Amino acid sequence: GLFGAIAGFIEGGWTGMIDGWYGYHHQNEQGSGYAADQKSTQNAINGITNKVNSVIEKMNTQFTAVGKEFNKLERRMENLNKKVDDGFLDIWTYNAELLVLLENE
C-alpha cells in the first residue's frame, strides 16, 4: 500500500465489525466490544458512489445501428465500412478496459 496501514502496521481485518468499514475495538473493566466510525465511512461512501456515477454517466452514446449491403462491384465500399466498424470497436474496448484497470488502483 502507498500509505503503509492496510496490510502494513495493521496486519489484518475484523470479521466482528459489521456495521462499517473502519472502527474501534475497546477493552476496559466493564467489558470489550467493537464499534464503527460513522463519519469516515460516510465520507468514503460519498466518494465511491460519486466515482461510480461519473463512470456510468461518461459512457452513454447513441445506439440502434444496423448493417448495410453491397453488390459484387462495390468491394472497396464494403472494405471501408468494415474498417470503420473495427476501428471504433477497438478504440472503445481499449477505453473501457483501461478505465476500469486504472480506477481499481
Partner: nanobody, 119 residues
Framework: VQLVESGAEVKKPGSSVKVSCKAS????????ISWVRQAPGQGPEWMGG????????KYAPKFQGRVTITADDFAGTVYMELSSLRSEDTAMYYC??????????????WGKGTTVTVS
Amino acid sequence: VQLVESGAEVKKPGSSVKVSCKASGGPFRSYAISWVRQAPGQGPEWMGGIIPIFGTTKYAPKFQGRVTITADDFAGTVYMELSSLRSEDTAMYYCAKHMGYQVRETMDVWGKGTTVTVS
C-alpha cells in the same frame, strides 16, 4: 431528491403484492431507504429498510417472515414484496429516505404514498 412509487393495487386475500420506489439523481445512492405504512385512522408504522453498498436489510418483528426488500442499483429502484395478504393490510405505503447510510429514526424526504386494498 424526489421519490416516486408505483400505482395503487387491489388484490384478493392470500395473494402477494410487490411495489417499487424510484429515486431521482444518480443511480447509486449514499443513503438508506425505508418502507412505512399507515392504515386509516392510525399513525405511521415502520416496516423495514435497506442499506447501500453493504446491502443489509432490517425488518420489524411483526412483519418479519413475510416481507422482502430488494434493490436494483443500476436503475435506482427499490422493491418491497408482501405475502399472505390479510384483510388488515389495506393501507397507504410510503418510501422514505434517511440522512445517512444507516437506518435510524430520522427520515427527511418522503414520497407521495400509494394505496393497497385487500378485499
